[PDB]
Amino acid sequence: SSFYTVVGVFIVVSAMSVLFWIMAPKNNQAVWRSTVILTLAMMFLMWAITFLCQLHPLVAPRRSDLRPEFAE
Amino acid sequence: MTELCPVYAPFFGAIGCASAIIFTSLGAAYGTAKSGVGICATCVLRPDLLFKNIVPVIMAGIIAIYGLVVSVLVCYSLGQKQALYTGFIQLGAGLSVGLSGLAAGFAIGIVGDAGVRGSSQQPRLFVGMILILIFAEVLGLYGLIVALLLNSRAT
Amino acid sequence: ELYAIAKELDSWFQDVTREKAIFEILNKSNYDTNRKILIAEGWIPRDELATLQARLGEMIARLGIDVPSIIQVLDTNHTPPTFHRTNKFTAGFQSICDCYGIAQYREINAGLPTIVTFPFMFAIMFGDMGHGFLMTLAALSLVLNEKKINKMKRGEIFDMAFTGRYIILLMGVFSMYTGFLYNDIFSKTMTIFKSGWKWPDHWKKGESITATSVGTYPIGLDWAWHGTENALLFSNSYKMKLSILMGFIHMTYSYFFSLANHLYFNSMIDIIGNFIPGLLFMQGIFGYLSVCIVYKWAVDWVKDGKPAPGLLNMLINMFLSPGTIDDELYPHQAKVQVFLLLMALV
Amino acid sequence: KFSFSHFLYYLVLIVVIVYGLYKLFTGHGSDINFGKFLLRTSPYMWANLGIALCVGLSVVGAAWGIFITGSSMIGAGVRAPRITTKNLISIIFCEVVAIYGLIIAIVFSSKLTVATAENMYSKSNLYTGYSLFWAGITVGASNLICGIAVGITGATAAISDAADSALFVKILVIEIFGSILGLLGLIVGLLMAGKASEFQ
Amino acid sequence: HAQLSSVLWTMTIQIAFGFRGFVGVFMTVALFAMWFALTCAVLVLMEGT
Amino acid sequence: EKEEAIFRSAEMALVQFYIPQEISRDSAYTLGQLGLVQFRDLNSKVRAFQRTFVNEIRRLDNVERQYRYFYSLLKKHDIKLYEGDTDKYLDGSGELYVPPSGSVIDDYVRNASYLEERLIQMEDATDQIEVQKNDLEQYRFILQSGD
Amino acid sequence: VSTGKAWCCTVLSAFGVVILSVIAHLFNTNHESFVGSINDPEDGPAVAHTVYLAALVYLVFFVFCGFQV
Q: Domain D8-193 carries which CATH code?
């Protein structure tokens, strides 16, 4: 799972955001197609950052206290 | 002993552990005393504002909580034959958090006194009080952050 | 006598307050004596203009005076008031955003972006599922019982909690999401997916082992980082770069409201003189840093065999010593770096 | 005229003078060997003192300016609570001062590494110890100075804005100058530590 | 927030896991009371604000 | 429909009200309980003490003074106000079709002016007798001392 | 007895039951986050049993205070 899985998730998130922007209820349309779109955007951005920092790490977990029964 | 691990190396670690809690506690004490004088002066007339005016002493307390955190973290990094590197790491963490929380507690005390007084005269000053007071708290927070960064390198 | 007063004094005060307010409004009318008319003026939303016309038509029917009662809407250069029509949901966010200051007439309302951005910055800073769950329960205790705490006296602190109930609800929910990404429920981590890090096959008790990257953790921080003595290094790198990236994104999104305001106010001069050069400066420095962070994550340095650049050192050298790129992040980085420096200067 | 602090100042001055004359006259002037003190002393004391004093003095200056200008603007806010949000840029620029110290502390903590005993007191390790020490002091003290200055200026700005909103604008320029001072301090600290290698 | 939560967990509730018997049960109950009181007070409320 | 005003503030229009002087009070009530008009202060450059309706405010402000004095007296003697929902039921707070108070406001002014003096009189009586009450209580406490 | 104390202890004991139950389960299943360290208790199920007993103590408190709600 290289960088392009982030792009794929971006694609599906963008599809959802455009779809909802089209289908936002008319009663509170601005509130809907602002709050839902911004939640999708920020949730995706934070997830992508969390995934990317782990994608090609420059630091690996390092500890001395791991109990040997968990080596499986 | 060794050149890297002198017998006097744990002195810096122990004194940093002491320094964190001590200076954060004096900062918190100044904040609590000043803001509590403000609260007691204010709430003679308007005791209804007790649970608003209590915020500055609470923030002073969280300063000492940051100091406690750092002191505990550096304390469990101490050892008899610990390196001089980790000794000065612990010293730097304790000194940074202590001095930062001391300054933050002084600022919190003064700002909280002024704020409780004003927000008793002018209720719209509550948000102003608290938003300045958080900006004073964040300085002790920054000192905590530096202490954590340093302590992450202890051994 | 005082008991007789108590049963009706409140209604007397309400009526007298209304009547005094009525005359204080009438003062703001120009009393034309020759025409024997109060020439009043007032701001009303245009969508409510019809309502005003209807209701005055109803009162004149009540009085039967058949007077013109002229609702003469007129053009003016005066700055109109800033009315934001808020539901129970967005009312708290509007109140917190306009406590700083009330928006210019018909400029973009910051409260609508705030609805999401304020709780979610709170969540990024807060970032625990146990504490986010506690906050969500606290908020729901106000939102589910909303009709009971409404029409009820609330004091001040509890009133503040109630008026922010949806603010606190979004804080709790986004904090649960953030703690999921931080992989924090209280102090402890979740182990719901296979870790991307696998420990060595065997080790002696007390041995300083190092994990190996069998993969990448799907969503959230890998639970293999829990309890590791270098957890702080990776967590700090992650959270610091997250702060920089998301702060840049939020600043850019808010700054594009400047472009939208200039477009709405037909102020192309603000677009060309202010928006375009400020955008070029902001991107060419800090958005460069942002795309640079994501690119550095996008490159497998250990597999490429190239030295991982000192990203903050490179940002510093972008200004204090241009051209002498220390570790080449990407080809022609020196030319692009000095071009961005010159563009920001220009 | 007497004060305990000045009494100790003069006492320690006299003691140091007498000790120096004693060492010099007996031919042991080289025993007071501040250079050998710099050589023998652990570089980590210098480095971690640099970081700790950087962030500590940055926070001291930030907090000092913060309570100056915050107390002034809360007092001025009693009649005009509008002053709070308008003059809060003063608190902001005071806090930015401490953020500078935090950034410099991060940069310098990147330099902290376990140097080998065989290479402990080399030219590079001593250089980086002194560099981090004095760069942290430079950034921290400049930040302390700038935070106090910005707090004084923002207090004056809040009070003037309470007097009249038109007087606020040109004092914000003074606050900008105060912030530029701290920014210059930060960049000079970066330049001082720019060529300082890690501990090796 | 992460470090305060971890330190509070270590100081308050994790100590109780080390003792057993009815003294262990009592320590678990009381130390959970302390842990939750400080979590709501210090972490959720004091630091959420 | 009414345009949502959350992305940008609602579009305002300035309305000039040509109100016949005879129906001014009723009209002011109508569009005040309607609740969508923010009035411009056309008389901003006229000193308040010489403004058009200053005396009508002054008499009602005296009435409000008298009512808050009554509230102070009720607190002094520990009586709780009714605070009934009759005003809430009458004032729709979202419905503009409510009739204003008639001549009853003049009755309020007269009643208030009379009743204030009535309360002053009886308060002075009760206060004077209470003063001599306290004085004679102190006298008794002095006399109760055996030695 | 009072409604305020009843609600406070009811809520605290509900969180006690839930959280100590899940902690006891994670100790009983030898979850790494609770047992994987040398510094953790050496025998998962043993401490799981006492955490479960504490969860039952908070269950008693929860049910009792419900009887006074």
A: 1.20.120.610
